[PDB]
Every structure is written in C-alpha cells, then in structure tokens.
C-alpha cells in the first residue's frame, strides 16, 4: 500500500496537497516527500486524478520548453495532450475543476499533486 495520506493507482502513489505554493516550491515540497510532480500521461491517469481533485486547481509535472516550442512531462517525454489558454507568459500547467490541462503562471500559488512508486 501507499504511505498514509497517499492514494494508490496502478503501482503508483499520489498525494493531493491542501497547501498552495509556486511551481518550484511545489517541486521542493514533493521532493521533501521523495516524490515528483505528477505525470498524467494517459486517459486513465487523467480520469483517476480529476475524479478526486474536484473543485480546486493543482500543479502537475508538465512544463513548457522555450527551447523546443513544446510542453514536456518532467520525466523527459513529449507532452501528449492539449493545454488550454497558452500565452507567451505561462510555462506551467494545472488540472482539476475544468475537464482539461490548463496553462498557468509558474509564479502563482496552487495546490500540487505529488507522485512516487508504491
């Protein structure tokens, strides 16, 4: 099983924060628990998380790469979905509330989803 307060899905463990912070701060929080920001790279994973996030927005492990002109998952794979409301300024993304991946400022405070192996 997962650690206390973490949630199991297909050999992986997920944590939904109540606290809000910036993307980098969220990266630091997840690392503080030996995890990384969530990679949500399949229909099944997106659905699993959307079902339990409900009505708040959460940073995940999806960032824009200036030098590539594409989004990438933080495990170094190309982004395989669509991000909404992109603009020259936003380099991060959230899920939750909406039905979609949504561009967000890396500097604005959001909750986070951390992920590690079970």
PDB file of C-alpha atoms in Angstrom:
ATOM      1  CA  UNK A   1       0.000   0.000   0.000  1.00  0.00           C
ATOM      2  CA  UNK A   2       0.913   3.686  -0.236  1.00  0.00           C
ATOM      3  CA  UNK A   3       2.087   5.784   2.747  1.00  0.00           C
ATOM      4  CA  UNK A   4      -0.603   7.363   4.954  1.00  0.00           C
ATOM      5  CA  UNK A   5      -2.436  10.225   3.157  1.00  0.00           C
ATOM      6  CA  UNK A   6      -1.292   8.966  -0.284  1.00  0.00           C
ATOM      7  CA  UNK A   7      -3.564   7.269  -2.813  1.00  0.00           C
ATOM      8  CA  UNK A   8      -2.895   4.148  -4.885  1.00  0.00           C
ATOM      9  CA  UNK A   9      -3.422   3.780  -8.624  1.00  0.00           C
ATOM     10  CA  UNK A  10      -1.704   1.155 -10.789  1.00  0.00           C
ATOM     11  CA  UNK A  11       1.558   0.678  -8.818  1.00  0.00           C
ATOM     12  CA  UNK A  12       1.907   4.417  -8.131  1.00  0.00           C
ATOM     13  CA  UNK A  13       1.122   6.642  -5.141  1.00  0.00           C
ATOM     14  CA  UNK A  14      -0.476  10.099  -5.387  1.00  0.00           C
ATOM     15  CA  UNK A  15      -0.658  12.981  -2.900  1.00  0.00           C
ATOM     16  CA  UNK A  16      -3.073  15.914  -3.173  1.00  0.00           C
ATOM     17  CA  UNK A  17      -1.931  18.914  -1.127  1.00  0.00           C
ATOM     18  CA  UNK A  18      -4.229  21.268   0.753  1.00  0.00           C
ATOM     19  CA  UNK A  19      -1.495  23.932   0.897  1.00  0.00           C
ATOM     20  CA  UNK A  20      -0.776  26.208  -2.095  1.00  0.00           C
ATOM     21  CA  UNK A  21       2.617  27.372  -3.389  1.00  0.00           C
ATOM     22  CA  UNK A  22       4.510  28.228  -6.597  1.00  0.00           C
ATOM     23  CA  UNK A  23       5.620  25.529  -9.079  1.00  0.00           C
ATOM     24  CA  UNK A  24       9.227  25.485  -7.789  1.00  0.00           C
ATOM     25  CA  UNK A  25       8.050  25.454  -4.186  1.00  0.00           C
ATOM     26  CA  UNK A  26       5.711  22.560  -5.137  1.00  0.00           C
ATOM     27  CA  UNK A  27       8.662  20.742  -6.732  1.00  0.00           C
ATOM     28  CA  UNK A  28      10.527  21.268  -3.423  1.00  0.00           C
ATOM     29  CA  UNK A  29       7.564  20.045  -1.335  1.00  0.00           C
ATOM     30  CA  UNK A  30       7.171  16.855  -3.429  1.00  0.00           C
ATOM     31  CA  UNK A  31      10.929  16.214  -3.259  1.00  0.00           C
ATOM     32  CA  UNK A  32      10.602  16.657   0.527  1.00  0.00           C
ATOM     33  CA  UNK A  33       8.460  13.502   0.398  1.00  0.00           C
ATOM     34  CA  UNK A  34      10.760  11.666  -2.039  1.00  0.00           C
ATOM     35  CA  UNK A  35       8.364  12.275  -4.925  1.00  0.00           C
ATOM     36  CA  UNK A  36       7.921  14.378  -8.067  1.00  0.00           C
ATOM     37  CA  UNK A  37       5.048  16.406  -9.509  1.00  0.00           C
ATOM     38  CA  UNK A  38       2.536  14.029 -11.127  1.00  0.00           C
ATOM     39  CA  UNK A  39       2.901  12.728 -14.683  1.00  0.00           C
ATOM     40  CA  UNK A  40      -0.628  12.478 -16.050  1.00  0.00           C
ATOM     41  CA  UNK A  41       0.175  10.934 -19.462  1.00  0.00           C
ATOM     42  CA  UNK A  42      -2.748   8.522 -20.078  1.00  0.00           C
ATOM     43  CA  UNK A  43      -6.575   8.848 -20.260  1.00  0.00           C
ATOM     44  CA  UNK A  44      -6.816   6.545 -17.224  1.00  0.00           C
ATOM     45  CA  UNK A  45      -4.459   8.668 -15.070  1.00  0.00           C
ATOM     46  CA  UNK A  46      -6.114  11.959 -16.055  1.00  0.00           C
ATOM     47  CA  UNK A  47      -9.500  10.492 -15.132  1.00  0.00           C
ATOM     48  CA  UNK A  48      -8.271   8.963 -11.841  1.00  0.00           C
ATOM     49  CA  UNK A  49      -6.973  12.346 -10.671  1.00  0.00           C
ATOM     50  CA  UNK A  50      -9.837  14.525 -11.992  1.00  0.00           C
ATOM     51  CA  UNK A  51     -12.244  12.269 -10.088  1.00  0.00           C
ATOM     52  CA  UNK A  52     -10.633  13.181  -6.731  1.00  0.00           C
ATOM     53  CA  UNK A  53      -9.338  16.752  -7.232  1.00  0.00           C
ATOM     54  CA  UNK A  54     -12.904  18.082  -7.652  1.00  0.00           C
ATOM     55  CA  UNK A  55     -13.174  21.910  -7.451  1.00  0.00           C
ATOM     56  CA  UNK A  56      -9.609  23.211  -6.995  1.00  0.00           C
ATOM     57  CA  UNK A  57      -6.616  23.556  -9.373  1.00  0.00           C
ATOM     58  CA  UNK A  58      -3.379  21.547  -8.981  1.00  0.00           C
ATOM     59  CA  UNK A  59       0.145  21.898 -10.419  1.00  0.00           C
ATOM     60  CA  UNK A  60       1.359  18.725 -12.126  1.00  0.00           C
ATOM     61  CA  UNK A  61       4.703  17.689 -13.670  1.00  0.00           C
ATOM     62  CA  UNK A  62       4.061  19.380 -17.016  1.00  0.00           C
ATOM     63  CA  UNK A  63       6.070  22.382 -18.162  1.00  0.00           C
ATOM     64  CA  UNK A  64       6.697  24.381 -21.340  1.00  0.00           C
ATOM     65  CA  UNK A  65      10.099  24.168 -23.014  1.00  0.00           C
ATOM     66  CA  UNK A  66      11.068  27.532 -24.508  1.00  0.00           C
ATOM     67  CA  UNK A  67      13.930  25.980 -26.493  1.00  0.00           C
ATOM     68  CA  UNK A  68      11.769  23.224 -28.035  1.00  0.00           C
ATOM     69  CA  UNK A  69       8.473  25.101 -28.593  1.00  0.00           C
ATOM     70  CA  UNK A  70       6.648  22.235 -26.883  1.00  0.00           C
ATOM     71  CA  UNK A  71       5.416  21.102 -23.493  1.00  0.00           C
ATOM     72  CA  UNK A  72       7.158  18.137 -21.847  1.00  0.00           C
ATOM     73  CA  UNK A  73       6.441  15.838 -18.932  1.00  0.00           C
ATOM     74  CA  UNK A  74       9.107  16.198 -16.206  1.00  0.00           C
ATOM     75  CA  UNK A  75      10.227  12.592 -16.825  1.00  0.00           C
ATOM     76  CA  UNK A  76      11.572  13.924 -20.158  1.00  0.00           C
ATOM     77  CA  UNK A  77       8.884  12.767 -22.558  1.00  0.00           C
ATOM     78  CA  UNK A  78       6.963  14.971 -25.002  1.00  0.00           C
ATOM     79  CA  UNK A  79       3.533  16.189 -23.887  1.00  0.00           C
ATOM     80  CA  UNK A  80       0.827  14.025 -25.466  1.00  0.00           C
ATOM     81  CA  UNK A  81      -2.277  16.148 -24.771  1.00  0.00           C
ATOM     82  CA  UNK A  82      -3.635  19.647 -25.326  1.00  0.00           C
ATOM     83  CA  UNK A  83      -3.033  22.566 -22.951  1.00  0.00           C
ATOM     84  CA  UNK A  84      -5.661  25.340 -22.964  1.00  0.00           C
ATOM     85  CA  UNK A  85      -5.171  29.128 -22.913  1.00  0.00           C
ATOM     86  CA  UNK A  86      -1.483  29.249 -23.822  1.00  0.00           C
ATOM     87  CA  UNK A  87       0.288  32.623 -23.949  1.00  0.00           C
ATOM     88  CA  UNK A  88       3.882  33.912 -24.226  1.00  0.00           C
ATOM     89  CA  UNK A  89       3.941  34.249 -20.410  1.00  0.00           C
ATOM     90  CA  UNK A  90       2.752  30.914 -18.897  1.00  0.00           C
ATOM     91  CA  UNK A  91       5.180  27.999 -18.647  1.00  0.00           C
ATOM     92  CA  UNK A  92       3.343  25.765 -16.177  1.00  0.00           C
ATOM     93  CA  UNK A  93       0.015  23.880 -16.088  1.00  0.00           C
ATOM     94  CA  UNK A  94      -2.731  22.673 -13.741  1.00  0.00           C
ATOM     95  CA  UNK A  95      -5.555  20.099 -13.732  1.00  0.00           C
ATOM     96  CA  UNK A  96      -8.741  19.977 -11.595  1.00  0.00           C
ATOM     97  CA  UNK A  97     -12.023  21.974 -11.709  1.00  0.00           C
ATOM     98  CA  UNK A  98     -12.047  22.055 -15.539  1.00  0.00           C
ATOM     99  CA  UNK A  99     -12.040  18.980 -17.780  1.00  0.00           C
ATOM    100  CA  UNK A 100      -8.697  19.982 -19.323  1.00  0.00           C
ATOM    101  CA  UNK A 101      -4.965  20.647 -18.949  1.00  0.00           C
ATOM    102  CA  UNK A 102      -4.712  24.420 -18.393  1.00  0.00           C
ATOM    103  CA  UNK A 103      -1.742  26.775 -18.771  1.00  0.00           C
ATOM    104  CA  UNK A 104      -0.731  28.593 -15.585  1.00  0.00           C
ATOM    105  CA  UNK A 105       1.892  31.037 -14.336  1.00  0.00           C
ATOM    106  CA  UNK A 106       4.722  29.177 -12.608  1.00  0.00           C
ATOM    107  CA  UNK A 107       4.870  32.029 -10.060  1.00  0.00           C
ATOM    108  CA  UNK A 108       1.215  31.861  -8.924  1.00  0.00           C
ATOM    109  CA  UNK A 109       0.280  29.696  -5.913  1.00  0.00           C
ATOM    110  CA  UNK A 110      -1.579  26.437  -6.499  1.00  0.00           C
ATOM    111  CA  UNK A 111      -2.073  23.123  -4.733  1.00  0.00           C
ATOM    112  CA  UNK A 112       0.039  20.232  -6.056  1.00  0.00           C
ATOM    113  CA  UNK A 113      -0.141  16.538  -6.869  1.00  0.00           C
ATOM    114  CA  UNK A 114       2.980  14.577  -5.969  1.00  0.00           C
ATOM    115  CA  UNK A 115       3.689  11.083  -7.256  1.00  0.00           C
ATOM    116  CA  UNK A 116       6.057   8.269  -6.348  1.00  0.00           C
ATOM    117  CA  UNK A 117       6.300   4.488  -6.796  1.00  0.00           C
ATOM    118  CA  UNK A 118       4.363   2.181  -4.474  1.00  0.00           C
TER     119      UNK A 118
END
